[PDB]
Amino acid sequence: AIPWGGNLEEVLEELEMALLAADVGLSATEEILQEVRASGRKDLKEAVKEKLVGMLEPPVEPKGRVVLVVGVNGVGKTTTIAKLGRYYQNLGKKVMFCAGDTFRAAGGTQLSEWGKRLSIPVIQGPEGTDPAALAYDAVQAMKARGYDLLFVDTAGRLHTKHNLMEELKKVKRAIAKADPEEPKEVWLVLDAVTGQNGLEQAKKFHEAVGLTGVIVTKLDGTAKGGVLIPIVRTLKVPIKFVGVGEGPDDLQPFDPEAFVEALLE
Amino acid sequence: QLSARLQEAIGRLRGRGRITEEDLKATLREIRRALMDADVNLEVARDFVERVREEALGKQVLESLTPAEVILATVYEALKEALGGEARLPVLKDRNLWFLVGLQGSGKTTTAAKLALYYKGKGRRPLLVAADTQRPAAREQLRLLGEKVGVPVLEVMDGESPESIRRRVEEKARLEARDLILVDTAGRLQIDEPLMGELARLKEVLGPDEVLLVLDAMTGQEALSVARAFDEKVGVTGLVLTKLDGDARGGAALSARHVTGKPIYFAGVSEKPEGLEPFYPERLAGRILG
Numbered sequence A: 001a002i003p004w005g006g007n008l009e010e011v012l013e014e015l016e017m018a019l020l021a022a023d024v025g026l027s028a029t030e031e032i033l034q035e036v037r038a039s040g041r042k043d044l045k046e047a048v049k050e051k052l053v054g055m056l057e058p059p060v061e062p063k064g065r066v067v068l069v070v071g072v073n074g075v076g077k078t079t080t081i082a083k084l085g086r087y088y089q090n091l092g093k094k095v096m097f098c099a100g101d102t103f104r105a106a107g108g109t110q111l112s113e114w115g116k117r118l119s120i121p122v123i124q125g126p127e128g129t130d131p132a133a134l135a136y137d138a139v140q141a142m143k144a145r146g147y148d149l150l151f152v153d154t155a156g157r158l159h160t161k162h163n164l165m166e167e168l169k170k171v172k173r174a175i176a177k178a179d180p181e182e183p184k185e186v187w188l189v190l191d192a193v194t195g196q197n198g199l200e201q202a203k204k205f206h207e208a209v210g211l212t213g214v215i216v217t218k219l220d221g222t223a224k225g226g227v228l229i230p231i232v233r234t235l236k237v238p239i240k241f242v243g244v245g246e247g248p249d250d251l252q253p254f255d256p257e258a259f260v261e262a263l264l265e
Numbered sequence B: 001q002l003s004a005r006l007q008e009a010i011g012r013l014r015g016r017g018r019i020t021e022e023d024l025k026a027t028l029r030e031i032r033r034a035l036m037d038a039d040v041n042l043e044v045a046r047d048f049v050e051r052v053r054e055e056a057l058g059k060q061v062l063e064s065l066t067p068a069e070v071i072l073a074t075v076y077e078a079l080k081e082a083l084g085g086e087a088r089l090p091v092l093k094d095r096n097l098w099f100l101v102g103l104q105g106s107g108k109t110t111t112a113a114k115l116a117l118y119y120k121g122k123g124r125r126p127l128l129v130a131a132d133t134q135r136p137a138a139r140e141q142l143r144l145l146g147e148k149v150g151v152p153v154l155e156v157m158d159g160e161s162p163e164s165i166r167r168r169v170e171e172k173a174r175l176e177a178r179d180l181i182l183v184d185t186a187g188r189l190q191i192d193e194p195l196m197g198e199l200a201r202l203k204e205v206l207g208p209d210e211v212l213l214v215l216d217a218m219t220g221q222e223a224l225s226v227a228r229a230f231d232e233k234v235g236v237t238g239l240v241l242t243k244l245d246g247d248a249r250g251g252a253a254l255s256a257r258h259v260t261g262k263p264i265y266f267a268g269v270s271e272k273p274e275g276l277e278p279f280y281p282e283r284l285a286g287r288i289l290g
């Protein structure tokens, strides 16, 4: 634990260890420490909290009707969509999903099972069907049927695979072909246990389709999700929600004060 | 082909004459920091550079006319050795039963099917066991992979006891002469005591000769605590490092091997069932440092 109250030199050394252990990374850690050393303040605990909470601000209301959910393989996209449906249906929205993962075994089935459990409709197609054509169809159903929110699942993909990032651009363009305002939200899903590669993921998804938000999953684990700090600093993309389990209720709006408190514990 | 920070750290010694211990200290600090930027856990990175320091001193680095090259070679050789030195695969017996375990999303189900395909091509007769009954469509996922690779899949029923799993697995394996049994388990947190207890009980009953911690290459600092807990609470015999077709440096592999002392057997290099090859410590050492 960081000895708040003790001498400055030992506070900064345990703060450095705490930030690095949290996956905050070398650059952002050094920036945090340099500012605090040039702070000159007796309540270092409150001054540190304030610097970190300021780094993380560049009910959650989507900016429009369509939310494209993106991220690398395994991070929590499909489950996060399920949770988002529960969150918004609890607020009285008419929600639907598009099972845009037509690539991986049981991708569609997994989302379809969530839809049944949640009483949320899922637009699906046969395996191998073009996800762009499917998303276009789902947006036209959303419009015709008067749905408030459509969440578009995407297959897991690595950000190093140019062809897969292009497919993702095609899905976004197909959404905009159906409704030129949309999608007004493009949300990256980031697994909390991820190290410095998280920043590279964010940069490359942002370059491809323009992120408007990040959701950090698996924060019920021991990982702090600290790579969010360099992500928000670099890209100025806000953190929208945190995932905190595997059930439909295990999603919380992002709370920067609590996030930072947990990061330093 | 080094990372910028290592290039700067090593490079600034070149052509400057013999070094002092102060120069060695400053260089090792930058090496430590580079390892952390490559997702080596901070404690493991410290232990590593302490080892390098004593090796470099013992090689008379302070009298070397090419200290930049001696330090670099010492780091590379030490990292290669710390990752296992050379490729090594699991020892096959007449009957093999392996668990795939790890965190949510790490690649376990895919890896079970990859191992089935790999060993089918080397004369084994695998059996896949879909023991994840909590994730929606988990058993269907493995069933579909099994069909793709031409390997049967025994699916565990909701609520089924470990003893019932053993009975059914033993009977199918005996009847069909299956000699490599690959048990795909649900993703779980290392601090989820009930689920870690469940996994330990399954090991006790099924008696696997390998328990493979499937670790995502992008895993950060928590790799140390994760691998330690899986090792202490269940018992890990080796690792599979997945998603190395990404650009994550893979420092978590060092964290995991440091705390368990266990081999990293295999690398995942594609989503496809064919995307498995032996882990090459030499290659990952170069990626971590590059």
Ligand SMILES: Nc1nc2c(ncn2[C@@H]2O[C@H](COP(=O)(O)OP(=O)(O)CP(=O)(O)O)[C@@H](O)[C@H]2O)c(=O)[nH]1
Pocket: A071, A072, A073, A074, A075, A076, A077, A078, A079, A080, A101, A104, A107, A154, A155, A156, A157, A217, A218, A219, A220, A221, A242, A243, A244, A245, A246, A250, B104, B105, B135, B187, B189
């Ligand atoms: N503990 C925990 N597990 C989570 C959380 N969010 C998702 N998961 C889990 O992680 C695993 C992967 O989730 P999934 O929704 O399939 O991820 P995905 O990104 O769609 C996988 P793909 O890229 O293959 O489509 C699942 O086991 C799931 O239950 C969370 O907040 N906490």
Ligand SMILES: Nc1nc2c(ncn2[C@@H]2O[C@H](COP(=O)(O)OP(=O)(O)CP(=O)(O)O)[C@@H](O)[C@H]2O)c(=O)[nH]1
Pocket: A073, A074, A104, A156, A158, B103, B104, B105, B106, B107, B108, B109, B110, B111, B132, B135, B185, B186, B187, B188, B242, B243, B244, B245, B267, B268, B269, B270, B271, B275
């Ligand atoms: N590119 C790439 N993708 C991989 C590799 N290994 C697994 N994946 C992918 O990562 C995602 C997660 O794989 P999966 O096998 O479901 O992981 P899991 O650990 O069983 C998920 P859970 O914990 O819920 O059981 C899938 O999209 C899959 O195709 C790999 O080596 N390379």
Ligand SMILES: O=C(O)N1CCNCC1
Pocket: B092, B093, B094, B095, B096
């Ligand atoms: O299959 C087994 O149970 N064996 C035979 C080969 N050596 C170890 C035990």
Ligand SMILES: O=C(O)N1CCNCC1
Pocket: B244, B245, B266, B267, B269, B277, B278, B279, B280, B281, B283, B284, B287
């Ligand atoms: O086989 C290995 O160990 N690899 C494969 C892909 N890159 C890193 C190491």
Ligand SMILES: [Mg+2]
Pocket: A077, A078, A079, A101, A107, A154, A155, A156
């Ligand atoms: Mg998915």
Ligand SMILES: [Mg+2]
Pocket: B108, B109, B110, B132, B138, B184, B185, B186, B187
């Ligand atoms: Mg699985």
